[PDB]
Design a protein around this nucleic acid. Structure first.
Length: 114
RNA sequence: ACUGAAACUGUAGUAGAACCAAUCGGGGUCGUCAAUA
């Protein structure tokens, strides 16, 4: 098949990583309201990712504290703007179809995440 | 159809009385980290 999409890239950020992702926009879609609680959760989540490694990246370390050869995941090296959840930014949404609606539980920067 | 003269706006009086640059804070301490395939 062919599709349009956005490439979601995070760096070679754990050792087994081979492939980035392309969010296939072409085919099917569901718009859901972005509440303040979701966006403030994202801010708290991404500030966590950034602050916990501030000492690491100031030391000039290039990757995770116990996984050599990996490289910092994008949201960690990204600036304050990554916390902001601005228009057109890409996320993973944790979703379930409870009560007959697509409930969005949380927004996450990676598949297996903080 | 003759300019008056001569005479220190000086003398006495404290920009001061009162008010705390101060109140709280052990130079301390432990769990991961990372997201794919």
């Amino acid at each position: 098949e062919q599709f349009e999409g956005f490439v979601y890239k995070t760096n070679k950020n754990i050792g087994n990583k081979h492939d980035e992702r392309v969010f296939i926009i072409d085919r099917e879609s569901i718009e859901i309201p972005l509440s303040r609680d979701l966006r403030r959760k994202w801010r708290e989540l991404i500030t966590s990712y950034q602050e916990i490694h501030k000492k690491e990246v100031d030391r000039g370390d290039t990757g995770p504290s116990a996984v050599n050869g990996a490289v910092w995941s994008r949201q960690i090296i990204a600036d304050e703007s990554e916390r902001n959840l601005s228009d057109g930014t890409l996320c993973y949404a944790h979703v379930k179809k409870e009560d007959g609606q697509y409930k969005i539980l949380n927004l996450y920067p990676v598949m297996i995440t903080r």
